[PDB]
Structure 1
Amino acid sequence: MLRWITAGESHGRALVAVVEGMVAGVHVTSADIADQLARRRLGYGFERDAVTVLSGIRHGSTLGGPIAIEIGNTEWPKWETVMAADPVDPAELADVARNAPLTRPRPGHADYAGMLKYGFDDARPVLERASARETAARVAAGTVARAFLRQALGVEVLSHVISIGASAPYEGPPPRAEDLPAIDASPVRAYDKAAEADMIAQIEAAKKDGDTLGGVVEAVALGLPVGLGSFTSGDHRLDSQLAAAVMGIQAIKGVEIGDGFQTARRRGSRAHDEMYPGPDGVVRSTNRAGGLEGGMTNGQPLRVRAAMKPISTVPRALATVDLATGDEAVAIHQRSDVCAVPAAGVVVETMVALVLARAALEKFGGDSLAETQRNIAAYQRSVADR
């Protein structure tokens, strides 16, 4: 089964992504990976294309075994001692200001709970793993999943920001032809020009106020066959899977499929997507469901929305405790950006792509892309021939 693992501290030597269980014969290259990593850097307002494929890909074609992708820490010389893997003379570390203890947990971050959980007196070991720099590894891994999805199913995963801060939410989703304008081209990775203006204005105002913003992104997966995921068990549902993968993203506090929480406010009479005959199979004219019924892809665009809390600690605003003393403190921020919502959309795409590729491989099996594609073709014929 497709599995992905991420390793790396934000300031440690390197990040690693390992993707296990991908079929041989999928075309992906380190350029594709660096491309997605660049997309992750999008948003009002990287470091660099040396990422390195360590294993699993040969001549741009997956080998069938584990694919390990390293992403180098571009400022490793700064962190070489502070985040040294090996022991470092504790006397030559007591001189290092960079190694000063972090004992004031940031509200909203892993710091406090992580410190108590692991018995750390310093938040460094926690924030190092917990930081959203980890999502770069996620994205390196999702690239394999995207390539597979495109090549096996003609599936495209994209995202667009629906709101940032108190902006007025957008309604009506993009296809893949729009990803270019959405992707920066647009500062807030907005599909809609009016929501874009409203969100840009939200960012300017929070920047000016010295504040930080969250937002809602929607990922959209197009071209998916019916019957990915299953209704046979709670955890087999794609719903469940997508929500795990998406909510596990740093700062994500909410997920919905299609109209989500708003569906919960509708009447059954207008909550669902009715079906009608077409030349080609059943057609629908709404997609309130967001492409999922009974935990399965239902032939409509998959739409996953995530709510991102503000991730950047606002500079001198948040009372905390200095865990060393028990005394009041002010939370010191680690990040300086007002808003990471647009890049969160790209992380969401990544998570969705991973789950989707795993589900596709579950149903269609195969050890090589050609074999999976044959099985996909046979399944599509069986659904067409009915």
Structure 2
Amino acid sequence: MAGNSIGQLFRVTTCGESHGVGLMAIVDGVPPGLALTEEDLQKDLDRRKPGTSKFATQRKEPDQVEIISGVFEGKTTGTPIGLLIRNTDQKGGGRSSARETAMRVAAGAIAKKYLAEKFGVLIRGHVTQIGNEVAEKLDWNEVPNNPFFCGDVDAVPRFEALVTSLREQGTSCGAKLEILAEKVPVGWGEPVFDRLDADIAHAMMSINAVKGVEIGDGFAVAGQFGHETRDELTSHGFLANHAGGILGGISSGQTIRVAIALKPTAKGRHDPCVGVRATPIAEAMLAIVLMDHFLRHRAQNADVVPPFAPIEP
């Protein structure tokens, strides 16, 4: 069955079998005035498989999302937004689990686009590891350039070789993704039980191969020592973002760092690392949580008193 809803104020409620007739979502709480169209959503959808009709050799135009309510004349009305995908599962039956993820990613798209305009929040994820290959550096312009979402232009070949290797031998490997949210206003999160890190973990943990979630330095913290605050020299600065942007479960101000670990996954099926495909959904999940908490934080302000630096519309 299903626990098919997520969010208090930004709410996504869904349904649909991968083999069923179609897939649906109702998304509540998105304020009126947001330019929004189907294309905005597909573009994130189609990001899940980074091919055009290019990617799978003879693949069709993919199944397309349709906005059924909530948008008037290109803009959000501020009523509940309905999404539909009709499954053109072309007329033992298998199942492709990109259909099971669609509604999340279409909804996250809505929360991304809203948070980018309003705040310039930018939510982006990259695979740091596949099995025994690690990326060692980050270049945002590189992650779209290779089919692993890898920020390290020199590991891409090494990742590529490991994928080529596994394919040969009827195996598959684990993955670790990092997702970041930047330009996130301070103060979001709801201790005790709805800390921003908690909802994040909750949300990420809805993705299927996930075995862990961490925030900031995450697990390394186990081995660390409390050597961060009392004495400085003249130059130094302790913005290492050890907390990964959440402290006491409310946003810092700093970028938000979350990592997750996806496990290995069971004609030639080119399996081998389905985990990299989780990036756009991991990005989706984070957006959905931040939007929810945006709305909660606003609902708890009689009205605003900044603070806001030289302004950066």
TM bucket (normalised to shorter chain) is 0.7 to 0.9
Shift of 1:132: 5.2
On the 8 A contact 2:138/2:152 being kept in 1, the answer is: no
Cα distance between partner residues in 2 of 1:19 and 1:277: 50
Shift of 1:138: 0.6
- Note if 1:53 corresponds to 2:67: yes
1:305 matched residue in structure 2: 259
Is residue 129 of structure 2 the alignment partner of residue 163 of structure 1? yes
Q: Residue 194 of structure 2 corresponds to which residue in structure 1?
A: 236
Q: Deviations over 1:70-125 (max 9, x none)?
A: 12213251xxxxxxxxxxxxxxxxxxx54xxxxxxxxxxxxxxxxxxxxxxxxx9x
Secondary structure in structure 2 of the residue aligned to 1:269: coil
User: Which one of 14, 20, 32 corresponds to residue 12 of structure 1?
Assistant: 20
- Is the 1:275–1:284 Cα contact (8 Å) retained in structure 2? no
Instruction: Name 2:105's counterpart in structure 1.
Output: 139
- Paired with 2:13 and 2:307, the residues of 1 have a C-alpha distance of 31
Residues 1-386 of structure 1: pairs in structure 2 closer than 5 A = 1-42=9-50, 47-48=61-62, 50-77=64-91, 97-98=92-93, 131=97, 133-168=99-134, 170-171=135-136, 178=140, 180-183=141-144, 185-230=145-190, 232-233=191-192, 235-270=193-228, 284-311=238-265, 313=266, 337-365=271-299, 378-381=305-308
SS at match of 1:255: strand
Aligned equivalents of 2:110, 2:226: Cα separation in 1? 39
Counting aligned pairs with the same residue, the percent is: 36
Seen in structure 2, the aligned counterparts of structure 1 residues 237 and 306 have a Cα distance that, compared at 3 Å, is: same
RMSD: 3.3
Q: Deviations over 1:263-298 (max 9, x none)?
A: 22111115x8x99999xxxx7531222111111111
- Distance in 2 (alpha carbons) for counterparts of 1:275 and 1:375: 38
Q: Mind listing any 5+ residue stretches in structure 2 that lack a counterpart? A: 1-8
Structure 1 Cα separation of the partners of residues 289 and 187 of structure 2:
14
SS at 1:4's partner residue? Answer: strand
Provide the C-alpha distance between the structure 2 equivalents of 1:284 and 1:209, rounded to a whole number of angstroms: 47
* Change over 3 Å in CA distance of 1:171–1:293 after alignment to 2: farther
Matched length: 296
How many Å separate the matches in 2 of 1:277 and 1:352?
37
Alignment-derived partner of residue 93 in structure 1: none
Task: Output one character per residue of 1:240-284: Cα deviation in whole Å (capped at 9) or x when no partner.
Answer: 0000000111111111112111122111115x8x99999xxxx75
What residue identity is the alignment partner of 2:149? R
Secondary structure, counterpart of 1:288 in structure 2: coil
Alignment deviations for residues 282-318 of structure 1 (CA, whole Å, 9 cap, x no partner): x75312221111111111110111111123x1x9xxx
Shift of 1:15: 1.4
TM-score (norm 1): 0.69
Offset of residue 348 of structure 1 = 0.4
In 2, distance between residues paired with 1:56 and 1:265?
Answer: 49
SS in 2 for 1:192: coil
Contact 2:63 2:88 in 1 (8 A): no
Q: Deviations over 1:184-225 (max 9, x none)?
A: x21211011233233222211111111112200111111001
User: TM-score, normalized by length of structure 2?
Assistant: 0.84
Q: Which has the higher helix share?
A: 1
Please tell me the residue identity of whatever aligns with 1:161. V
Preserved contact between residue 40 and residue 136 of structure 1 (Cα < 8 Å): no
User: AA paired with 1:66?
Assistant: P
The offset of 1:172, in angstroms, is 5.2
User: 1: CA distance between counterparts of 2:21 and 2:234?
Assistant: 57
Q: Against the structure 1 CA distance between its residues 363 and 342, is the aligned structure 2 distance closer, same or farther, given a 3 Å change threshold?
A: same
